[PDB]
């Protein structure tokens, strides 16, 4: 029903394992359970993908939307932002 995507952006100064993908799995997962552990049972799924190693990241968070009130992207927008904000590399 509802579809959302977060245009991530990293750097090409890496040549061994990308923390980007690991950042989504750590968040998309931690966030998911966060709703299941805090709210017991919610309604929202998260996914991600890589758009060329020398271009940009393509995040695709699939959510039905209904009882979220736009309070789940706070972590997604922060994780990606902080990633390209300071460095965290």
From Swiss-Prot:
Annotated localization? Cell membrane; Cytoplasmic vesicle, Secretory vesicle, Microneme membrane
Tell me how the protein is altered or processed after translation. Answer: Proteolytically cleaved at the N-terminus to generate a 74kDa intermediate which is further processed into a 72kDa form. The first maturation cleavage is autocatalytic, occurs in the ER and is necessary for the subsequent SUB2 trafficking to the microneme. The second cleavage may be mediated by PMX/plasmepsin X.
> What job does the chain carry out?
Serine protease which plays an essential role in the shedding of AMA1, MSP1 and MSP7 from the surface of the invading merozoite; this step is essential for productive invasion and the release of the adhesion between the erythrocyte and the merozoite. May cleave TRAMP/PTTRAMP, thereby shedding TRAMP from the merozoite surface during erythrocyte invasion.
The entry sums up its family as follows: Belongs to the peptidase S8 family.
Instruction: Show the domain comment.
Output: The propeptide domain acts as an intramolecular chaperone for the folding of the catalytic domain. Also acts as an inhibitor of the catalytic domain thereby regulating SUB2 activity during secretion. The transmembrane domain is required for SUB2 progression through the secretory pathway.
Question: What is the protein's name according to its record?
Answer: Subtilisin-like protease 2
Question: Which species expresses this protein natively?
Answer: Plasmodium falciparum
Full-protein residues shown: 553 to 641 of 1342
């Amino acid at each position: 029903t509802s579809k959302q995507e977060l245009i991530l952006v990293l750097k090409g100064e890496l040549d061994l394992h990308s923390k980007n993908m690991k950042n989504v799995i750590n968040n998309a997962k931690k966030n998911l359970e966060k709703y299941f552990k805090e709210h017991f049972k919610e309604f929202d799924k998260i996914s991600y993908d890589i758009s060329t190693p020398i271009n940009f990241l393509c995040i695709f968070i699939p959510t039905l939307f209904d009882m979220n009130n736009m309070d789940l992207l706070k972590q997604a927008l922060l994780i990606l932002h902080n990633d390209l904000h300071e460095y965290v590399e």
